[model samples]
Target: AMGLKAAQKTLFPLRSIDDVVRLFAAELGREEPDLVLLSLVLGFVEHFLAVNRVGLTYFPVADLSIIAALYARFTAQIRGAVDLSLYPREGGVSSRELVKKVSDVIWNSLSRSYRAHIQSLFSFITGTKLDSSGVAFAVVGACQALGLRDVHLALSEDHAWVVFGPNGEQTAEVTWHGKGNEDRRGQTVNAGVAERSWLYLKGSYMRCDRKMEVAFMVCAINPSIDLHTDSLELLQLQQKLLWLLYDLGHLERYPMALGNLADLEELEPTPGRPDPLTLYHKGIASAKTYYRDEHIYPYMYLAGYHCRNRNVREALQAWADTATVIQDYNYCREDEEIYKEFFEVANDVIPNLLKEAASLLEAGGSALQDPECFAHLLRFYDGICKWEEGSPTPVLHVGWATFLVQSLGRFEGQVRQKVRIVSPVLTFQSEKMKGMKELLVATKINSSAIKLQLTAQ
Candidate 1:
């Protein structure tokens, strides 16, 4: 009876994209992309603190200001790589145009760097250079933006991941139906159909044989001339090329499969095509259940077979190389086992963690001359010291510190207490030292106003 009473409004359809966004955002809870990106970056700080055994006291919003500034600088490089215009620093272009430009630049810059970074890092594990740049920030950011936080939920707190596969390994094979024109339900995803296939290949999904007219099918629903329309055919061609290289035993060709997909399409445009992403997703759904074969099989296909089978070590290495790309950003599977393993190894093997403190101090004092870096060093130094004790550990502390600093500013002076130093866990004890003291203070004029009341003159 209550349910019926509360229900109403069948009269008209909902209007506006904002309404759609709000609905989706609510359904996603805190896992919404805008927030998830921030949260995932926060996870990185958490991982750092946990590994180092840092005891966190309080975070000053200033830390976030500092990090936001640094990220702006680093992200600039990503902006340069893409064709999109990221101009008009403040109030020139429409907000929509600004977002599109920035997002496009991020996509381009990140794709190039992520693979290079991930490939370089993954090599540490396998002792080989995997040509793929699987470790990049853009893809991870996309994941965060897409509301894929649940995938990270299953991971360990000390862990992080450099995953590049579309959807996820678990749902990679599941086909997704286009919720036509965003009226239906689905989280936002940056990895378009062809792009997802690219991710699968770059991240080491098994290579496969294409048996159909095309590896992907363009949906009839989408307009014919739109640039993404022919993505299905392009991916099919890309897949075939990759398969050919795998079949022919050429490693260099693997990299050939990796390029600016948008650029490649410029060379070969197919107007009036279906949505390859939707088609590939369907293919995955159709073939996903057969993932158990382990070996290459029918229906279920591993899109990154060459990297999967021949260059497992390279694949892993490529994945690791991308850590720096994502270091400052809160993207990637925050608590994945791979991330934990990486941190553990960094703690045990990389003496630099402790040594870096001195370096950071020196850098802060000498050549680097960046107070922000120095503050970061202090935070890290303090955090590491806490790791020895039964504290929260270094990784988590660092992750938290990083989170605070990146989003806030170090000069705001709040994240230091969270760092753990060796032997005695370094902690900052300051409840009264917040910069927002002015707001907290009582004004005499306002104080007097409350005591006064309207009275007969």
Candidate 2:
């Protein structure tokens, strides 16, 4: 009698974004909320709003019959594909094999290609597609469907994968990352971790629970009604939902989701919640607390806000902190995203600050003259040089070298000298640190062997 009873929706339609938010609250209020259903609901609503270009008050809002149908199909598909016989509930196969079995089903489900969309089963079903993160999400979601509750999501800054088995230590890739990488699914990523690439986050990536999975769905919401606009209701829905998750203490470990919420809050201030700046710092703190201080985006997010708002000193300090985080990772080809982030900040953002240096000085504010500014500037270079040290890939070209040294020269020579340097790495000791500019510019040879060196007296 319960056969195909899943085909019908007993719940009423979510006729408004507020209703959707309330529904989320209601579901999340219980123990072990239905994540598969919730993610599909979010994806369906986002898809409808995005494709139709409709207002928040549109009729027959967010009909769940289709979602229910899709969810039912997805559940059965995963359940059917994942044979618990081969991978027993108690033993037999390794967790890696079990996880791969789930991942392969999800991986093989998608079409050869499509424009990547929200990370949800609805997107997977409708487009026969999912992005890198989505594929990982699907694997864990499917594992949940199979009663493999030990499996969970492991998230790096730009990638997602799975960790399974007892205590969840075992790992595997579920999707291809970036463009043109070979699919290395169902393997441990120890090489990437050991290499200290930011892509792997030096083993400080988030290992998430069901609540965090829902948080990721919230993060994935595409609020845009059009290219130039977003639904305010969608934004508020996302904002409030994030706060709900935040209040539940689930957002504490996921830095990027916290950062995402901060960006939304920045766009439209959420009264009585923490200010966006506070939220941003909370993100930064989460990264530091849990992510080995290896995260770049949390710092970058704060810096971008500070840069846009013209908090000059604060901005550089944030960037300096970002550079510190970057210094911990080796330069790998897979790290191109962070490369661009640093390159933009180093070559464009910091340089842009100096274009107004004179005016800033003339206004009787001494940001450029502050020794700590000079210290942070040096610390910024220290990070870049340290990042360049062990990598086969080079970080600074002569143009960048010239630009950075010139940027350093803008600080008063004595002010630059005041910053102390001590390293387990080494020293190129000198009172003629400014004169090293000649060495930096020497023979136009790309640092020849050394990245760059400055030691203070």
Candidate 3:
């Protein structure tokens, strides 16, 4: 990746509106007659963010002069692709609209295939149940960060574009569940199947635990199928992780969030044995030094949770572990090629993870854990564990109030199960946590006949 310093536009903190406009156009797709260039730009940006690892695609040198040639070379490839298929910088509105509609079709068509390709590729590369939705979401997010708009929706065969002249047979697909199998599993598809598939998959990754092998088999054959938290071996722990994340978001105590995320990973590291949650926390701390939330949360949350929990030292190490245990490990055989692209991105990201870890360790109040309070921690962890875990049996999925009902002991039976009860429900403002007894309540009636005893399980 050669550097043409002049062409190397700043990546963050835009100083002008044009920068965002350019980025948005690049991500969303340019008008055909009017801004065809924009469509190509969006494609490239998606390619760069979603799967292209930095080192293989761009200069890694810190000094601009040394990387100038690499930057220029890389940009040349980008511009060449853009020039071949995109609209020139300037164009007319009618042509622009035509390009957008067509480009959307093309993108949708290819993106459908692309989604499958990504899942297949990741499976081949990682062997573990890599989050296809998370990966897709990250790409979309990267596009958004680059200033893309309306790109929030996942690209699919239907909503995408395809031009007649030359870009006609783009050849791609992005179905969560292959179109034919919608009714096979009896799975519910919410609004925007494509987008929801991606979101649910991402959430699956966010809520995954290490007790079991990667769900690669289920993911590959039926990408749209939901893996409910309660059905997995790590159900209890997964719930805790979700609540912890939610609580962290509330406290604004990121370190704690990072550490808890690490703890979850310790339960499921790859390679040989389980990793210590502390390791993930520490590594995330290291990542924070260089990477920010954009590079941190989604990436580290998945990576760190597995590694930090398992005490992994590096990305490659974690990959090896993940590849080894997952049943459908063939997907990651081409690991070198896949990760070769990620090295550069990793280099750019590690520092940020490191910093976050350090801050939690350095700050007081069980600072190592980003101590919000023991009560808070118990609440966060317990609430998540129960709610997320749901059914104790196989076939993970949520289970109504049964999820919240925790048993005290074998002797206690169902009667000893814990059910929440409080006073008058209260409401908080637009922003803030709900105070004690201000959320739920119990009702009672003893008029004449029916005598009911209900005070929680």
Candidate 4:
């Protein structure tokens, strides 16, 4: 319901990050917060702090001079650049053609060298390139600026795009996805989703309202100043803002944002708030109960937290849950980032934790003795096996294969025999598992042959 002019007039001269939070609160309180203006203002602060290595309080802009100027500059560039005459219409309707035009304008406006991950309006003035996430956002923000209210952002765990039309049924790829830059910009997103790519999360991808867009902006706040250190002030500000969104019920359906909030709480827990793990579980349930387990990061966030806390068994279960969630989609070449994510878990984390699991068995209940641990291990690799099925790209290589044999080999044959290969058991049915058996048998571990039924059906 609010206009940019009114937003600019009302939200000026921010004295502190709390003022920014209040502004977000006030704007989100309306029927619709101006996405373009909100992104610009939020990015104005975030971009300045990140580039200059300054806390938000140290930034000099007040009285809306630079902010307003940047707004004007982008308004001029976007307005002058996009030709509305190409698709002139007045009724409450939108089209993929018009959407593609806007997507093209933003995509062409980018500098060739992608640099800034932050989607601030300041980047336009600074000539900093927008990355994939930023580009998708830039398109949505552009549409919002051009008064296309129907257009909204659609988000997966690792990618962002747009959707619009009646009931927001239509979709389009407005940006590059990952290292494989075969972009589908200005094209509908149905191809990927229909292919069952985990990257799109099928129908589980979020169709965000203006408030959830603000949540994404809040979630993007990276306070880390270096590999080992962070700007505490920025972290605190981000915390307060996330809590603000949580309080507003804006985070009820957003599992990733809840995980972000829990991450911060883990660092410096608020006194009376739900503890970090509780919030993490809240995120997990948000995804499982509401989103039908479409999102992946919530489980990863939990596993990462447990892993950091030295809770190896708990971490193992969490990661198995992560693998469970990931099993829903077939892998594709565009899923390179997710491949790396699973790679880290399979290779880096699994090896280290299995050693730790060895130690835990020396004292606390051993995963080796537990049938569920073997089940969880099989579930983890089985999900990965599902990921590798029917794709042009292979998910595993020498390193992955090496780790799988190494980790799966760790379990004693007695315990392995105790676990049933139920359902599709496609993982055990594969040559990889058959080949792994050679290593297992060669290692003096006798295998009990189990039949894999047609559970994949």
Candidate 5:
């Protein structure tokens, strides 16, 4: 919260990297070793060092004048950039939100491209290769932006992630930048059991004895579990929002207006209500400003909601909209891998749902009363066949499909009913019969045979 003028005054006295390092190290010694705060301090020093055009070999006294100004500007850029309330929730921390907040702040304001330019410039100046620690610096500054005091950086020799709560027990692995840890699946441990594995760190935040780098790399290199698309879908959507903000050229300041995009609240199934779907649609509508595949996810959710209400036609329509978007365009190939499960459902599972719709339309009646039965059937088929395979299709899709099938009179007996068919066969008289056709006996046999053939025909 230091003002530009005061921040400048405080920074002006720092004549060397040693001075800057010592200043923060002493502060850290007095307080907890906040990896994030320290990194921000490092960033300020690094940025200042670069901006002043200082040679890598020495810290210039001549550059001291610019230190205050740089500190002031950088501090201002980080101040109030995030609001913790946006991600406030009880229980284990949601790393997705934390990741988005950090990613948005860093990528939007300073930007990876911009930081890379700085790193390259520094490398050229020093003639010594400098390591890239942009994400580290970003997380630190972002935590500060959110006014988070309960959190600090958890360092395990080489890797870094957010540690929240007093005693630094809660850990949040947001993103791995570009190198080792790529996505949420790689970074998060015990992800399936969010409360136990992802958060509630039992050890110290910075455990000198515990080498986290190996473990970190192990998880990143070979994830223990596969992510269910439903979980992944929402995470990717939030990530998409981060990139969208990055595109908007407003990365430094969090978009308070888009607060709803931060978390996916669970919605209960109501017989006649589609509130969840409505909210999802609203979110999609809001994102139209940066619409593309962004709108597709919301539409998918919308379809699911309608299906839950036994509104098969409406659900299919929504899914069709989603299908159109997927078919009509291509997005980042990297992104496709993350959302591959969803596309699988859209391309394959959706076709089956469409057939169900056709069968329903074909069987016209006041079978609307049987909607629940069809809904159950849809759930059984999707749960047993589709969801069991782990398709990222929303449960709502199955729920709605169930309703459609029953309500539209396409249930078990109605559509896939069993039918019996009988066909007539003909037999002709041969020469062998002529020998047996002796007198009255042959005449009687011939007459009986002729009558039997006529009846069969």
Candidate 6:
């Protein structure tokens, strides 16, 4: 009945893009376009604009042969859009510039109210929920109408957005569906306009290969690049170290050398039948399969690897990095096996390593006075303690407290005795402390005051 009504209402000779859209609007109002009809109409409109290099205004759509080709061509274009070599760049133009141009064209073309209407239209056609990806594709379609090319769809784990421009200064990335251009949590708007940057594009997507490409682009543009501390390369380097350590049989033996710690598998419940040990290795995995940015494995693994190498400072920093990620992303849900595993490893190892590192640094090393070194230790201290409630055992908290007291004693001179030691795990030592501790009686006096007050209470 709906199809028949649509046919009756629509006069023959729909001449232009506007006429076709009006007919589509009528058909849509009667009943949602069937999948076949929706695809055919959208495809024809998209292809006619692209192939003939004409804008959406007053384009003739009378030829049936062109309509047939449009269907075939548009379908192929979407599927093969990931292939970059297919879209050649202009001379001396960067991918970033091209992307920015395409995004701007789409962004500036429509009024706010008109874009909202089109957004609703796209939702009706695609049968997908409205999101950044939806808004992006709608932009792409609009760009097509404007006779633009080299616009492509790139998908991250859970979200979608558009990238376009041939050879330009910057490749523009925009997500219109959920919120405006700024990230959901922060204020890093690109180009002082909407969210634009290959940074937002990196690990948010599925293709690890494409992820690495964007990751490198991020590193390249950074004003302060340190290869040692660069997160992406550090992660990659740690994975290689993990493999090397495994091959040399060091990982297993080194853990035993630290102390005969109980096997993680033996201590934790292996509910849900997780994967067993294998000869081949896996990359750092995430609980949210769609996104890679939240995985804590690389930081955790780097911590272990550095500890084994006696790079206590690096190990502490790595564990701190791990804790910071967990806090920021809440990567491990309470009921998840990853939550259990993360807690198990963190509780089992990180505290002890922090203790060792603090002891080493406090023993009159040059690192004891390095302000940056002191800052990293404090960050590690704070970040790890944030996980106190999440630990299956109290040992992590105990280890952290011990490290904190030792740090305060060593840095008491630098911080002018403003540091407070509040944990029960810290005990007053009668042994005269060496180095910076000898210069400051404030930590010792404060410690006595705390003890005396507790004694009175």
Q: Rate the local accuracy (lDDT) of all candidates.
A: 0.26, 0.74, 0.27, 0.74, 0.37, 0.37
Candidate 3 deviant stretches above 4 angstroms = 1-86, 90-275, 282-399, 408-457
Model 6 ranges off by over 4 Å: 1-293, 331-351, 354-371, 384-457
Q: Please report the TM-score between candidate 5 and the true structure.
A: 0.32
Error of 4 at 361 (Å): 5.5
The deviation in Å at residue 219 for candidate 4 is 1.4
lDDT for 84 (candidate 3):
26
Off by over 4 Å in 1: 1-32, 54-63, 85-134, 137-457
Where in model 5 is the C-alpha error above 4 Å? 1-11, 29-58, 62-65, 79-81, 84-99, 110-133, 177-182, 185-187, 191-457
Tens-place lDDT per residue, model 1, 74-186, is: 33443344333443333221222333333344333332221121222112112222221122223233333332332221110121122222333322111112222222112
Residue-level lDDT tens digits of model 5 in 1-457: 2332333345445565445544443433332333333333333344333332324354434244444444444455555565556676455443456555665565444333312223221222222222333344344444544445444445431235555554554456643533543465224433322221111111212421111211111111111113321223223323333333333332222211122232223332324433455556554554454332333455556666666565655665565455444432222222333245454553445545545555666785223234433333333222222221222332223433333333233343433222111111111122221222231112122344332322221
Instruction: TM-score each candidate.
Output: 0.20, 0.86, 0.25, 0.87, 0.32, 0.27
Model 3 residue 416 CA deviation (Å) reads: 11
Better of 1 and 3 by lDDT: 3
Task: Give the C-alpha miss distance for residue 317 in model 4, angstroms.
Answer: 1.7
Between candidates 2 and 3, name the one with more favorable lDDT. Answer: 2
Q: Superposing all C-alpha atoms, what RMSD in Å does each candidate have to the true structure?
A: 28.3, 4.9, 18.8, 4.3, 24.5, 20.4
Query: Which candidate do you rate higher for TM-score, 1 or 3?
Result: 3
The sequence of per-residue lDDT tens digits that candidate 3 reaches over residues 237-265 is 23233333333232122332444434444
lDDT of 4 by residue, 1-457 (tens): 3245665467678777877877877888887786666666767676545544534347535457766676777777778877777876546557888888888888777776744335654565567467677788788878877878888888998899999887678898888777747768777878888988888888788889888888887787667666676667668878998998999899998999999999999999998999999999999889987788877888899999988988766787888888777766778767777788899998898788787777767775366666676666766776776656676666766566566666766777666666546331223534344444333324244323211211121
- TM-score of decoy 1: 0.20
Error of 2 at 373 (Å): 1.7
